[PDB]
Design a binder for this molecule. Structure first.
Ligand code: HEM
Ligand code: HEM
Ligand SMILES: N=C(Nc1ccc(CCNCc2cccc(NC(=N)c3ccco3)c2)cc1)c1ccco1
Ligand SMILES: N=C(Nc1ccc(CCNCc2cccc(NC(=N)c3ccco3)c2)cc1)c1ccco1
Ligand SMILES: C[C@H](O)[C@H](O)[C@H]1CNc2nc(N)[nH]c(=O)c2N1
Ligand SMILES: C[C@H](O)[C@H](O)[C@H]1CNc2nc(N)[nH]c(=O)c2N1
Ligand SMILES: [Zn+2]
Lengths: 411, 411
């Protein structure tokens, strides 16, 4: 009832009791482990109050007035509003608490040492896609901060019935378009090919190039989504160069500075926020390794190896690995030379071990998903590879949710 | 009851029913995933017969005479011998079946495409440590095959009471010694420092250098273990050079060609083989990444970066990664130029995906441990990173077992 996780590079041992508070299920059983399954899988007023109570008990405990007067009043207050309205509404302070702890509890996030430095934008007063666009631009401007990136989340109105849902249809606020060609191959980002075509289906006019920043497709209160183009001056970009290889500029690559996922769902006290774009900053490998060198992505290991003068004949010449490291030196170098916030997989993973310590001390644990925490290159030369991690689901939390075009009733 | 695993780089989907036959437990629950815990945790005659029956049913099913005459006779035959002797004995064919399937079921093994090409050496007639030495030398000679390595296992007598146990005290038949210095630091291999000192405690005379091949410490039928030096002509070594950097020879590194774990425990039909050294061949990264560049191992990223002329000031210069790829090009290059069998993490992981296909088709599944299958460098540029894997425990199986010096009664 008090589990042990060990680091096999420092012999450090930490004891986990936080998993006790766990509640949601993981997909694993006693006889099958699903820790490498990518996605493992309206709400009534009965279910809603334990969840509100649970949440409120930790919120007041966190400001050191658990079970007190102001607590039991709010517990009663929310009880009454759930009877009356069949749902309820979070205080501004409760929303900011919930959000930050949804991030704190994100077991796949290696960035959580920053979880308490999160700027919460309350867009729960929003009613239209244009208001969403306006809130999102302000999010993008604020979080970017001229390259001194700041973490932020904008939280649109909670789901109510279910047919009234606020959704950002983009998977990230800033994404490069993907177009398939006549010869099957893909210009731009292959990951977004279907979304890029949804934007054209609803009206986008595509500059059919590479790094074309997609428009926002914004759905408000269940209505059909509408297209908006982020003012380009708000979309900060780092052109990627290499600190030794001047042919690297000729590759003509760039990436946006601001990673902001917008397709996820924030759960706080049983309430569901289907549109809650959050941004922080990139770890280099997300761009250099996955974005650039995934096969079903920009897939540039071919060209970079070529220009490097590489033995591409034999698999075992590690030409793929060799080009992979150069691409990531270039990503980091480029971003830092432009004073755009980026972290390398070594700093980020040491910080996560440091974060893990603090959590086990002042919280009794840290849910962590090794499969996702270990960076996609140079696994074992980073301290998280050697760190045992217990994965369990705590709430408040960020959840996967269906793509809104699979679920929506159009017209 | 029929689970789906997906490859997110090829969109290939495979369906797992093999996990049904699973029986042993994984450490995970519905509310906690332990897929990154490194080690998750006498036998009576009651327990022994279902296990024998279970095993025999799959063995006869595998030669296409399930439940037949020759089956029910052996089922009865083993039933009677378990009543009589309180244990039993495997046919030569049953031992070879069990062993190969213990390997087939090793979910952390990326090498299993070869599982049916395994040479089984029956050393169940062994009675003394000298016989163990002799069987082990023959294993080493055969498996090495002058560098055209062949997979093999030597199986010493099963555990009986528990105080009579055959054990190889080494963790691998061929390992480099580790000595701590006056100034705390370590010459040779730090991993083996305690074992290297156990060998001195029982009588070894250490050439206190780097790549000193340890002696065998062999325990027979529970008796105290005895030291033997593998004839050096049987210990094949690859001196590591780089195909471009002639200063790499100056590093003066070498590794043994033969990976043979000997500290594990083979379970077949409920019988327990506490001494069952198995060997195959190395994937490059085990040497180049873990052996050489683990912090608590040879830890040579320092010196290789230096000689490469590298920006070692800033963590984010990826100098660690850059030196890591060169070290692994050198390992592979060296081994292949010496006609010593080695596989690169790209060939090995593509083969495992290919292996995974065959298993899901002609077996209904393949237990796999993503945490261990993904190589310790260049994770996502290999196809196994993108392959969802279900981990579950099938039998026959290889199991972890206590180090014999923590459990043994000396004198
Ligand atoms: C501040 C700097 C941050 C860094 C360096 C960082 C880093 C990362 C990385 C590398 C991943 C893996 C994602 C992938 O491979 O696609 C991840 C996952 C995640 N991050 Fe963080 N992140 C940061 C901030 C945040 C913030 C501010 C939030 C929420 C408010 C957040 C929530 C999450 C969630 C929910 C996931 C898992 C999503 C999924 O399962 O796909 N992160 N993070
Ligand atoms: C034939 C070529 C083989 C290759 C390339 C290979 C590769 C690997 C690798 C890289 C690992 C991870 C081990 C580590 O990181 O320390 C592993 C694990 C393992 N292999 Fe294979 N292996 C081979 C043959 C075999 C054979 C012949 C057997 C048994 C008869 C076997 C049984 C196992 C077991 C039981 C594990 C897991 C051990 C543990 O959990 O520590 N392997 N293999
Ligand atoms: N579609 C695919 N699967 C698939 C792949 C990935 C996912 C989830 C991706 N989370 C994206 C994500 C999530 C969280 C953080 C970041 N990054 C940051 N720094 C960041 C953003 C905000 C703060 O920090 C990126 C879901 C499905 C696929 C892959 C290959 C072919 O297909
Ligand atoms: N002691 C530590 N933990 C720890 C680390 C590892 C283990 C298990 C290691 N299995 C070793 C192993 C197992 C199977 C295959 C290979 N390889 C092959 N090719 C091979 C051999 C035979 C056929 O193929 C290597 C157990 C405990 C540690 C790590 C860092 C500091 O401490
Ligand atoms: C199949 C596997 O679950 C999939 O590749 C996961 C593995 N780990 C990951 N880790 C991160 N950070 N991001 C990812 O997309 C993935 N993908
Ligand atoms: C903590 C973690 O479980 C540990 O580092 C594991 C991770 N994956 C591994 N994978 C392999 N192949 N070998 C290992 O030693 C490990 N170590
Ligand atoms: Zn699990």
């Amino acid at each position: 009832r008090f589990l042990k996780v060990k680091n096999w590079e420092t012999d450090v041992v930490l004891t986990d009791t936080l998993h006790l508070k766990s509640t949601l299920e993981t997909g694993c059983t006693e006889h099958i482990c699903m820790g490498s399954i990518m996605l493992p899988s309206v709400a009534t007023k009965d279910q809603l109050f334990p969840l509100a109570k649970e949440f409120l008990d930790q919120y007041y405990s966190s400001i050191k007035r658990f079970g007190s007067k102001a607590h039991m009043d709010r517990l009663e207050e929310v009880n009454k509003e759930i009877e009356s309205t069949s749902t309820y509404q979070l205080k501004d302070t409760e929303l900011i608490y919930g959000a930050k702890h949804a991030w704190r509890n994100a077991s796949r996030c290696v960035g959580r040492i920053q979880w308490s430095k999160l700027q919460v934008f309350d867009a729960r007063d929003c009613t239209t896609a244009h208001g969403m666009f306006n809130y999102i631009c302000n999010h993008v401007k604020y979080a970017t901060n001229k390259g001194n990136l700041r973490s932020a989340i904008t939280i649109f109105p909670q789901r109510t019935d279910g047919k009234h849902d606020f959704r950002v249809w983009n998977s990230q606020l800033i994404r490069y378009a993907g177009y398939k060609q006549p010869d099957g191959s893909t210009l731009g980002d292959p990951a977004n090919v279907q979304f890029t075509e949804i934007c054209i289906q609803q009206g986008w006019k595509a500059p059919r190039g590479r790094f074309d920043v997609l428009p926002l497709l914004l759905q408000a209160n269940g209505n059909d989504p509408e297209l908006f183009q982020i003012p380009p001056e708000l979309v900060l970009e780092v052109p990627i160069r290499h600190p030794k290889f001047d042919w690297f500029k000729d590759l003509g690559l760039k990436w946006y500075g601001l990673p902001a996922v917008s397709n996820m769902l924030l759960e706080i006290g049983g309430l569901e926020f289907s549109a809650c774009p959050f941004s922080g900053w990139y770890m280099g490998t997300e761009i250099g390794v996955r974005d650039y060198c995934d096969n079903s992505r920009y897939n540039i290991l071919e060209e970079v190896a070529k220009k490097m003068d590489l033995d591409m004949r034999k698999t075992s010449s590690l030409w793929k690995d060799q080009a992979l490291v150069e691409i990531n030196i270039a990503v980091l170098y480029s971003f830092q030379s432009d004073k755009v916030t980026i972290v390398d997989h070594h700093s980020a993973t040491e910080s996560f071990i440091k974060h893990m310590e603090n959590e086990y001390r002042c919280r009794g644990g840290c849910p962590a998903d090794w499969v996702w925490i270990v960076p996609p290159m140079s696994g074992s030369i980073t301290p998280v590879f050697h760190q045992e991690m217990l994965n369990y689901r705590l709430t408040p939390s960020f959840e996967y949710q269906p793509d809104p075009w699979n679920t929506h009733v159009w017209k």
